[PDB]
Amino acid sequence: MFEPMELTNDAVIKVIGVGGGGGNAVEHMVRERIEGVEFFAVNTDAQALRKTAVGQTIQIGSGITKGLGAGANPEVGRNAADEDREALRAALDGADMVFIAAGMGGGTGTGAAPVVAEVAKDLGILTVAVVTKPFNFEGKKRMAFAEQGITELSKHVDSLITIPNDKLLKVLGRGISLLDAFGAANDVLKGAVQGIAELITRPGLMNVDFADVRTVMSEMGYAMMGSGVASGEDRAEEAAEMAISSPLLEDIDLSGARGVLVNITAGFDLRLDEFETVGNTIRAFASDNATVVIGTSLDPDMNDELRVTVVATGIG
Amino acid sequence: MFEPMELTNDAVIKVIGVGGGGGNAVEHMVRERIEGVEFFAVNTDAQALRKTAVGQTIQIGSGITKGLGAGANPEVGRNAADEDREALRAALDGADMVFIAAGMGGGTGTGAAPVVAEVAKDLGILTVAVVTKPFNFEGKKRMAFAEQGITELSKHVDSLITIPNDKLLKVLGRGISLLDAFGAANDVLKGAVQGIAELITRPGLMNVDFADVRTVMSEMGYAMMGSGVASGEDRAEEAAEMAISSPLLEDIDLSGARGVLVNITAGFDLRLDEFETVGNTIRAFASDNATVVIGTSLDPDMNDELRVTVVATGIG
Amino acid sequence: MFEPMELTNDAVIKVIGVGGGGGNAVEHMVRERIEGVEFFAVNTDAQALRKTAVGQTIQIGSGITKGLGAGANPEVGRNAADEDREALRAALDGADMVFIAAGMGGGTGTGAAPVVAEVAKDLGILTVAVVTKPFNFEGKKRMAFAEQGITELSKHVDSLITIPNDKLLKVLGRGISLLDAFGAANDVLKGAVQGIAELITRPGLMNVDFADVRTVMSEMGYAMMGSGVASGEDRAEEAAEMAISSPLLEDIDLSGARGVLVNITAGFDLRLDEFETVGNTIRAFASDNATVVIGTSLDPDMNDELRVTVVATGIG
Amino acid sequence: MFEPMELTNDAVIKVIGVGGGGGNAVEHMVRERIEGVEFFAVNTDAQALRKTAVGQTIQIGSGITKGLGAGANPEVGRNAADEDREALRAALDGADMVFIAAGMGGGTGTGAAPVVAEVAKDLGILTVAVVTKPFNFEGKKRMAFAEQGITELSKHVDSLITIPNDKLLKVLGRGISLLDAFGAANDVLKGAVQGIAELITRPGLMNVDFADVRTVMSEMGYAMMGSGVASGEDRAEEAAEMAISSPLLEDIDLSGARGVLVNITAGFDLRLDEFETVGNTIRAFASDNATVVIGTSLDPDMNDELRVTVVATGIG
Amino acid sequence: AQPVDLQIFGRSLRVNCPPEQRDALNQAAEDLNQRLQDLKERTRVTNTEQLVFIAALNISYELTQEKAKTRDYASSMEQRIRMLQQTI
Amino acid sequence: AQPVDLQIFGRSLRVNCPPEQRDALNQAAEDLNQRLQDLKERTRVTNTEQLVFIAALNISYELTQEKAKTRDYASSMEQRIRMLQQTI
Amino acid sequence: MLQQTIEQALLEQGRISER
Amino acid sequence: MLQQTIEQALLEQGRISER
Amino acid sequence: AQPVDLQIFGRSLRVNCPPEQRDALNQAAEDLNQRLQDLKERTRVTNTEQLVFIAALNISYELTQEKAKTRDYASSMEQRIRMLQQTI
Ligand SMILES: Nc1nc2c(ncn2[C@@H]2O[C@H](COP(=O)(O)CP(=O)(O)OP(=O)(O)O)[C@@H](O)[C@H]2O)c(=O)[nH]1
Ligand SMILES: Nc1nc2c(ncn2[C@@H]2O[C@H](COP(=O)(O)CP(=O)(O)OP(=O)(O)O)[C@@H](O)[C@H]2O)c(=O)[nH]1
Ligand SMILES: Nc1nc2c(ncn2[C@@H]2O[C@H](COP(=O)(O)CP(=O)(O)OP(=O)(O)O)[C@@H](O)[C@H]2O)c(=O)[nH]1
Ligand SMILES: Nc1nc2c(ncn2[C@@H]2O[C@H](COP(=O)(O)CP(=O)(O)OP(=O)(O)O)[C@@H](O)[C@H]2O)c(=O)[nH]1
Ligand SMILES: [K+]
Ligand SMILES: [K+]
Ligand SMILES: [K+]
Ligand SMILES: [K+]
Ligand SMILES: [Mg+2]
Ligand SMILES: [Mg+2]
Ligand SMILES: [Mg+2]
Ligand SMILES: [Mg+2]
């Protein structure tokens, strides 16, 4: 059979929601219908697993908690993760790169995300962890547990994204619904996952592929990932500034990034000055020792739109 | 059977596009339908190889990158080239002169072009390499990798053509499309290849042939190749100054050339003063120790057009 | 049979390209695949009609020009339109509103657009004429013919959009291709047609329909129509200022508009302050005696993307 | 059978060489292989008719000269033309536009060209006459006969092109062959004919056709026709100034033209500024009361060339 | 010959056809539309600028496969019919 | 499945084919090359942007015209052979 | 009956051959 | 003789059917 | 294939010929030389730039006349020989 070619790469990307917060963040993407990504929910709470819209679930520590949450004990979460490490490895095997989502400060996520990260690293999988700090009013003990957990998580990941949960109150403005604030928080992980997937699979005139992703995230540190879209006369500048804007992320210094990966997607009318303006926006913060890779993907599907996807790692 | 004579020489000329940029430059010529030349695409990225309209492809380093790009690592490109040296030798064997095209700064092209050049040189093939520098906004490290790669490439090529990618922003003018800006750069390699082929094969009143090409390219250094076409009263002068105009090439000094090769093509009405004006244009920059060879080819096919092809090597 | 309800209105909209320029403008929309709209090409030149990608054609004046152009004679164009008025009426009958596109200055478009407009007005159809002035270098007589033709066209249309062809030179930038420069002008008519159709058919929370379109086009005058799309934090403001920006239109005074029709389309997360900012953008220029209608259409189909369509008539 | 469309117009163009000089000028085009045009040779001299490479011949006045020339008698030429008017009418019937070529001063051409022109005008055919004055050394009486003949010819031709034969001595240069000097003069008629044919038949983005030709030639007077071709950076300006350059024509004032017809042909990369520069070149001389028509024809066949064809009539 | 207009695979075409082949052209357009429509989702991202080329090579092979049978069964039946003619 | 190159009508294509249909692909390529060559020589100036579309509609009509004979003579010979079987 | 089957086969192959 | 021609015709129709 | 050199009608030519057709080429050269040499004085002053054209159309006509006989007498002998076979 004479078949047309398939110019789409093959990628295995896994998103794991550990604990209640991570389960919520993953369920956000599930309800938003993002294709090409495997969804998971790992928890100690049977009720939370049964409630989520995430299809595949992995109940950890059924023999230590009997289907109850860890009860704000990181040790219980770590023990429940250690008990079911085989199930984690089996469900996480054969993956190019995983995205671990976990709101941290409690028992399950805080003590269980480092174990999943360790499983992935031992398996030899690039790992990105997207976590949220507790609110200010949740106490000092909650924040201390979250910080210790984040240290343990950074011990076993390649790039870590931290969302202070207190920036929702400052950024989103009063009158915002709780559901909408949480959705704004979850959009960080959704945008990161979707941008990485589109960059890895879809081809381009100046191709950037999984190897570029591996070589920019080959060094531990904080990271920012996102995309921007614009139209009109100033579409290039607007899209570039949207891509590198992180209102909800922790106060981050892009100049300290040691790896920058940019992909520009537009129609065939992409002018050279627009490409130059995106490149100049990227160069505005990139350091002299950072590995900057700029990619372009002219797509007839994009009618008059310009999308810019920026991945910056190695920060701090 | 009584057959008319064939007054056309035989030449084997190969154009190899190493990496994404080189593949783009070669597929430009493929889409423009240039005859009498073999086309190749050498890469580590399977997706880019399957994308290109370049017909014959040589996937290098399938056992080190598993079909992915080099990830901006020159060492990975060199290793992937060394792994599959036999395929390069087999595809490049039996060639009079090769034209290696590679956009330099990344991993595949930067580290792989010197290996292909070494294969051609130890095989005993005259080699011309047409490469592009990275943009200004792509960083200092990208430019450093490209410069080191060009230093390595100079060791195994007889003549090297360098196109600073930053001159597209300065020469072409605002509003130019990315596709047309890149096509302007691709036309340098297209003009070089087509001019050299037409010079080598087709005969002439004052014949210049492959031996003249070999004796002008016996001196290592930078080079410029191109052609000009004109009509009307000032056809000779206009074509001569069009042939030695290189807006997109790096700032070059033609007076430093150690070898100049000129071929004038026109109809039988070519006047003596036109030939003299072309010769004076060439003498305006040719040095006293340079080997200048002037060729003429009166062709009834050229109705009222005058074409001048100039090859100058040994610069810098 | 258990039938799910259809919430889409029904509208008949016709786009007629009279002469070469109008045929080009309509063929642009045909190639861009705009749905729900009828396309026509009306001309005296048989070769141009057979060239265009516009499917259905209406060759006028086959008995006065014998399939040739009008030869820059407006009188010949008017006579050729009067000869085949029945074909125009038959193809234009049963229409809610027509969009006549023509490039004034020549013979066919200049003298034939007023006749088609007269046919539509006699039939009782809302008429919008999108025309282009000649270039500066095309002469004084060409511009005089175009101005006389536009004066005649103003008698039989409801709203007229004029695009000075000399603003392409000033706005687009030195280096833009002719095809892209002409596509920029064609996008004015494309945006007008697509915005009007999308407004008339699709429902909304604060519904605006064909009656509002009729009551804002109930007065002769210059008009501007277009749409703006944006995303991100400033999506409302960016889209609003994109909708009322007309770089290629003749120098226009929005404050003189006596009818403004605005439609905001977004997802269910559209905040109240975004709606207020769009309303304030509209109020910034709307006069006190103008009939302003603001519409909203929350669409689950639409992503975090926001679109604003503005129709302003009665100017000048 | 499903057949592809034919976008080429149909035109009948006749070139008649009356007398020895006209026969020479026509057989120049015959030997240069110009397609799509009918060739004729009208003469009184049987020997010259049997010499010429022109295929179709029309021996006039076989009953007054018995196959000999007119012997420098304009009256004999007029009588010989009047005798065989039916053959001229039959061969010249069914023609859109004729091009009468005749070297004036002698007997056959001088007295016979006005009769052929009268036949064409009575038949209702647009007529263009390309004639040459005698040399300086050929005498005062030869020049007087030629001037009287041109005065007669002006009565029945829509546009007349006059080539002073004395400008060959001043323009071409000492040492030019007689054959090449005469070929330079013949190229005026060849360029006029080929440019007009290519303009009338092949289509364009801004189509100009036979009607435009008729409306620019509706004004009696002198005319100039020609084409220019260029490549490179200044292709538009070079081609424009080449098209309106007439070294061999009589001292002419383009500002007095009452009709200008321009057609620009290039590839799809034709930039807007190139079109503007051609238009500015045309505007540099076009008067305010002249009908200027600018046409464009983007052709994939034109690889990187740019052709400009200019027809200016009504002069003097 | 009365040039007809078609809209195939989102790509307007203009062909002149004899009046008697009009309906054959319409059904050919439907067949081609369906063939290319099935060729679109065979691969998610491809060089769509080449898709009609495969849509023509596939039907070229599918035409040869059935074209060979034209002579195949014709020859077999012809030898059978002449031989039964000759016996009786 | 072992992607292979083609160069058809001055337009390079890449199609992956099973090993057993390779020669069929080559012959379809020559048939298409010849068909489009005959189409180009049919007209002086045309829209080459649509020429392969005509080259596919023509072969689809030429496919159906002879493909209907497949069941035509099939049904004829089936009925004849059933009736002959039933008699003897 | 077997004499005419081959005779009518000729007519049916006539309509095949013209087809 | 006529008995077997129809029998082999069945094999020929079978090879057509799989053809 | 070992390019040969000829001097025909005062006009040097270069042809490559198989070794076995050398003498045939020489005899064709003499025939052409004689044909054009006879064509020269057929007219005192002419367009000699066309003379080889008539020297080729004349032998084209002469080839047609005596080439049609190849099939003529072949057909006649065929009918006579088959008929004599069938009688005895
Ligand atoms: N942005 C969000 N933050 C959340 C969400 N749920 C929890 N959190 C934050 O994350 C912190 C961790 O709480 P979780 O309920 O996710 C703890 P988990 O269920 O993983 O552990 P145990 O229930 O203690 O076993 C919590 O203090 C909040 O500040 C959510 O849906 N969105
Ligand atoms: N003029 C052009 N320059 C290009 C093009 N593509 C890339 N480049 C330039 O060349 C530089 C090298 O980038 P490439 O993508 O060609 C590197 P390659 O694919 O050969 O190596 P890896 O992908 O890192 O394995 C890049 O930084 C650009 O400045 C192109 O199409 N045209
Ligand atoms: N933006 C564009 N303007 C155009 C285009 N074609 C023409 N024009 C402009 O419109 C003016 C009218 O030229 P047209 O060719 O449209 C005249 P038309 O064919 O309607 O009349 P005749 O050919 O004289 O019968 C012309 O002077 C240009 O300034 C086009 O494709 N785009
Ligand atoms: N540029 C050219 N001018 C020519 C040529 N032949 C003649 N002429 C010029 O035109 C003038 C007219 O001379 P011709 O011989 O053409 C006169 P014709 O044969 O038409 O008339 P009779 O022979 O007197 O019957 C003559 O005086 C020359 O000045 C020619 O081949 N080229
Ligand atoms: K990619
Ligand atoms: K040579
Ligand atoms: K509505
Ligand atoms: K035309
Ligand atoms: Mg819990
Ligand atoms: Mg690569
Ligand atoms: Mg027109
Ligand atoms: Mg004479």
The 3-state secondary structure of chain B reads CCEECCCCCCCCEEEEEEHHHHHHHHHHHHHCCCCCCEEEEEECCHHHHHHCCCCEEEECCCCCCCCCCCCCCHHHHHHHHHHCHHHHHHHHCCCCEEEEEEECCCCHHHHHHHHHHHHHHHHCCEEEEEEECCCHHHCHHHHHHHHHHHHHHCCCCCEEEEECCCHHHHHCCCCCEHHHHHHHHHHHHHHHHHHHHHHHHCCCCECCCHHHHHHHCCCCEEEEEEEEEECCCCHHHHHHHHHCCCCCCCCCCHHHCCEEEEEEEECCCCCHHHHHHHHHHHHCCCCCCCEEEEEEEECCCCCCCEEEEEEEEEEC
Distance CA C285, CA A273 (A): 33
Ligand 2 pocket member B69 (CB < 6 A):
yes
Strands (E) in C125-242, as ranges, are 126-132, 159-163, 221-230
C24 is in an annotated binding site: yes
Chains B and C touch (3+ CB pairs under 8 A): yes
Angle at B299 between CA B297 and CA B303, to 5 degrees: 130
C-alpha to C-alpha distances, C247 to B199, C168, D139, nearest whole angstrom: 50, 9, 66
Token pair, residue A139, equals: 């106490």
Which of E36, E37, E43, E60 best probes binding to A when mutated, by most A CB atoms within 10 angstroms? E43
Token pair, residue A257, equals: 């990034």
CA-nearest residue of chain G to E71? Answer: G17
Burial E48-70 (b: 16+ CB within 10 A, else e): eebbbbbbbbbbbbbbeeeeebe
Residue length of chain I: 88
Parallel, antiparallel, or unpaired for β B306-315 and B221-230? antiparallel
A138 is in an annotated binding site: yes
F1: distance to nearest CA of chain B, Å? 13
Phi, psi of B225 (to 5 degrees): -140, 140
Q: Among all chains, which residue has been given the structure tokens 């292709």?
A: D235
C109 is in an annotated binding site: yes
Contact B137/A276 with Cβ under 8 angstroms?
A: yes
Q: At what angle do helices H2-17 and F51-87 cross, to 10 degrees?
A: 150
Distance from the alpha carbon of residue D109 to the mean position of ligand 12, in angstroms:
8
Q: Which residues of I touch B5 (CB under 8 A)?
A: 3, 14-16
Torsion on CA atoms A93, A99, A103, A105, rounded to nearest 10:
60
For residue A148, what are the contacts with CB-CB under 8 A and spacing of at least 6? A74, A110
Resolution to one decimal, Å: 2.7
Which of F71, F78, F84, F87 best probes binding to H when mutated, by most H CB atoms within 10 angstroms? F84
F10 touches chain B (CB under 8 A): yes
DSSP one-letter string for chain G: -HHHHHHHHHHHHHHHHT-
Distance from the alpha carbon of residue E85 to the mean position of ligand 2, in angstroms:
76
**In this structure, which amino acid lies at residue A238?**
E
Contact A310/A235 with Cβ under 8 angstroms?
A: no
For residue C98, the cross-strand partners are: C14, C127
Q: Any idea which ligand is nearest the CA of D109?
A: 4
Which of F35, F53, F69 best probes binding to E when mutated, by most E CB atoms within 10 angstroms? F53
Protein residue with its CA nearest to atom 5 in ligand 1:
A21
Ligand 4 pocket member D106 (CB < 6 A):
yes
Contacts 24+ apart (CB under 8 A), C168-171: C168/C248, C168/D272, C169/D272, C169/D273, C169/D276, C171/C247, C171/C248
Residue A256, Ramachandran bin (φ over 0: left; ψ between -120 and 50: alpha; else beta): alpha
**In this structure, which amino acid lies at residue C96?**
D
Distance CA C20, CA C44 (A): 9
Q: Which residues of F touch G17 (CB under 8 A)?
A: none
I76 touches chain B (CB under 8 A): no
**In this structure, which amino acid lies at residue F4?**
V
Strands (E) in I1-88, as ranges, are 3-7, 12-16
Annotated binding-site residue numbers of B:
20-24, 107-109, 138, 142, 186
CA-nearest residue of chain E to C33? Answer: E10
Read off the DSSP letter of residue A292: E
- Dmax over Cα atoms in chain F, in whole Å? 65
Protein residue with its CA nearest to atom 27 in ligand 1:
A134
Token pair, residue C90, equals: 């038959």
Token pair, residue C115, equals: 């006749």
The Cβ of residue D117 has, within 10 Å, a number of other Cβ atoms equal to: 27
Q: Among all chains, which residue has been given the structure tokens 């007629």?
A: C16
SS (H, E, C) A17-72: EEHHHHHHHHHHHHHHCCCCCEEEEEECCHHHHHHCCCCCEEECCCCCCCCCCCCC
CA I51 to chain centre: 16
C85 is in an annotated binding site: no
**In this structure, which amino acid lies at residue D115?**
V
Could you report how far apart the first and last alpha carbons of chain G are, in Å? 27
Please indicate whether, in this complex, the C-beta atoms of C177 and B173 are within 8 angstroms of each other.
no
Protein residue with its CA nearest to atom 16 in ligand 2:
B21
C-alpha to C-alpha distances, E74 to E68, G2, H6, nearest whole angstrom: 10, 21, 17
User: Which run of H or of E encompasses F15?
Assistant: strand F12-16
Contact D230/B231 with Cβ under 8 angstroms?
A: yes
Torsion on CA atoms E28, E33, E39, E45, rounded to nearest 10:
150
Token pair, residue C118, equals: 């007269």
| Ligand 2 nearest-atom number relative to CA B18 | 20
D178 touches chain E (CB under 8 A): no
Please indicate whether, in this complex, the C-beta atoms of E69 and H19 are within 8 angstroms of each other.
yes
Task: Order the strands of the A3-4 sheet from edge to edge.
Answer: A3-4, F12-16, F3-7
Q: Which residues of E touch C30 (CB under 8 A)?
A: 12
Show which of residues 200-229 on chain D sit within 8 Å of chain F, judged by CB atoms.
Answer: 202-203
Token pair, residue C196, equals: 């009007």
Neighbours of G (≥3 Cβ pairs closer than 8 A)?
E, F
Which of E11, E22, E47, E53 best probes binding to F when mutated, by most F CB atoms within 10 angstroms? E53
Please indicate whether, in this complex, the C-beta atoms of A5 and F16 are within 8 angstroms of each other.
yes
CA-nearest residue of chain A to E43? Answer: A6
Parallel, antiparallel, or unpaired for β C306-315 and C259-266? antiparallel
Please indicate whether, in this complex, the C-beta atoms of F3 and B50 are within 8 angstroms of each other.
yes
Ligand 4 pocket member D19 (CB < 6 A):
yes
Angle at B182 between CA B176 and CA B187, to 5 degrees: 115
Q: Among all chains, which residue has been given the structure tokens 């931290």?
A: A162
Protein residue with its CA nearest to atom 7 in ligand 1:
A21
Q: How many CB pairs under 8 A join D and F?
A: 32
Q: Pinpoint the alpha helices (H) of D32-173.
A: 46-51, 74-83, 85-92, 108-123, 140-153, 167-171
Burial class of residue F69 (count of CB atoms within 10 Å of its CB; 0-12, 13-18, 19+)? middle
Q: Among all chains, which residue has been given the structure tokens 């910080």?
A: A147
Contact C175/B173 with Cβ under 8 angstroms?
A: yes
Token pair, residue F8, equals: 């058809």
C-alpha to C-alpha distances, H19 to D182, E24, E73, F70, G17, nearest whole angstrom: 73, 26, 11, 11, 21
Phi, psi of A175 (to 5 degrees): 90, -10
Sign of CA dihedral E4, E6, E11, E12: positive
Token pair, residue B44, equals: 């580590």
Token pair, residue A73, equals: 């004990």
Task: Order the strands of the B159-163 sheet from edge to edge.
Answer: B56-59, B38-43, B13-18, B97-103, B126-132, B159-163, B221-230, B306-315, B259-266, B291-298
G3 touches chain E (CB under 8 A): yes
Q: Among all chains, which residue has been given the structure tokens 């905001």?
A: C264
Contact A42/E79 with Cβ under 8 angstroms?
A: no
Closest by CA to D70, choosing from D1, D19, D30, is: D19
Burial class of residue C301 (count of CB atoms within 10 Å of its CB; 0-12, 13-18, 19+)? exposed
Distance CA C92, CA C111 (A): 18
**In this structure, which amino acid lies at residue B127?**
T
Read off the DSSP letter of residue C251: S
Distance CA C63, CA C60 (A): 8
E56: distance to nearest CA of chain D, Å? 15
Read off the DSSP letter of residue D7: -
For residue C194, what are the contacts with CB-CB under 8 A and spacing of at least 6? C34, C227
Ligand 2 pocket member B185 (CB < 6 A):
yes
Distance CA B132, CA B18 (A): 12
The Cβ of residue C128 has, within 10 Å, a number of other Cβ atoms equal to: 28
Q: Among all chains, which residue has been given the structure tokens 């490490």?
A: A85
Distance CA B221, CA A56 (A): 63
H19: distance to nearest CA of chain E, Å? 8
Sign of CA dihedral A149, A154, A157, A159: positive
Burial class of residue D111 (count of CB atoms within 10 Å of its CB; 0-12, 13-18, 19+)? buried
Angle at C264 between CA A192 and CA C238, to 5 degrees: 55
C198 is in an annotated binding site: no
Distance from the alpha carbon of residue C193 to the mean position of ligand 7, in angstroms:
15
DSSP one-letter string for A100-154: EEEE-SSSHHHHHHHHHHHHHHHHT-EEEEEEEPPPGGG-HHHHHHHHHHHHHHH
Distance from the alpha carbon of residue D204 to the mean position of ligand 8, in angstroms:
6
Distance CA E58, CA F16 (A): 12
Q: Which residues of E touch F8 (CB under 8 A)?
A: 53
A2 touches chain F (CB under 8 A): yes
Sign of CA dihedral D61, D64, D69, D70: negative
Contact D261/D199 with Cβ under 8 angstroms?
A: yes
Distance CA C165, CA C130 (A): 12
Token pair, residue C181, equals: 């420069």
Phi, psi of B163 (to 5 degrees): -115, 105
Token pair, residue A281, equals: 């926006």
Distance CA C31, CA C281 (A): 33
Closest by CA to A242, choosing from A257, A229, A256, is: A229
Closest by CA to F56, choosing from F31, F85, F87, F74, is: F31
Angle at B269 between CA B263 and CA B272, to 5 degrees: 65
Parallel, antiparallel, or unpaired for β I3-7 and B306-315? unpaired
Neighbours of C (≥3 Cβ pairs closer than 8 A)?
A, B, D, E
Contact A269/A237 with Cβ under 8 angstroms?
A: no
Distance CA C199, CA C213 (A): 9
| Ligand 2 nearest-atom number relative to CA B70 | 25
Q: Any idea which ligand is nearest the CA of A209?
A: 5
Chains H and F touch (3+ CB pairs under 8 A): yes
Shortest CB distance from E5 goes to which of C31, C33, C55?
C55
C-alpha to C-alpha distances, C253 to A303, C192, C222, C310, D58, nearest whole angstrom: 30, 18, 10, 15, 70
* Surrounding residues of ion ligand 7, Cβ less than 5 A: C 209
- Dmax over Cα atoms in chain D, in whole Å? 66
User: Which run of H or of E encompasses F24?
Assistant: helix F22-40
Ligand 4 pocket member D82 (CB < 6 A):
no
Distance from the alpha carbon of residue E31 to the mean position of ligand 11, in angstroms:
37
C-alpha to C-alpha distances, C39 to C27, C116, D207, D240, nearest whole angstrom: 8, 15, 21, 37
Shortest CB distance from E81 goes to which of G2, G3, G6?
G6
Distance CA B172, CA B154 (A): 29
Please indicate whether, in this complex, the C-beta atoms of C232 and A242 are within 8 angstroms of each other.
yes
The SS3 call for residue D112 is helix
User: Which run of H or of E encompasses F75?
Assistant: helix F51-87
Parallel, antiparallel, or unpaired for β C38-43 and A38-43? unpaired
**In this structure, which amino acid lies at residue C249?**
L
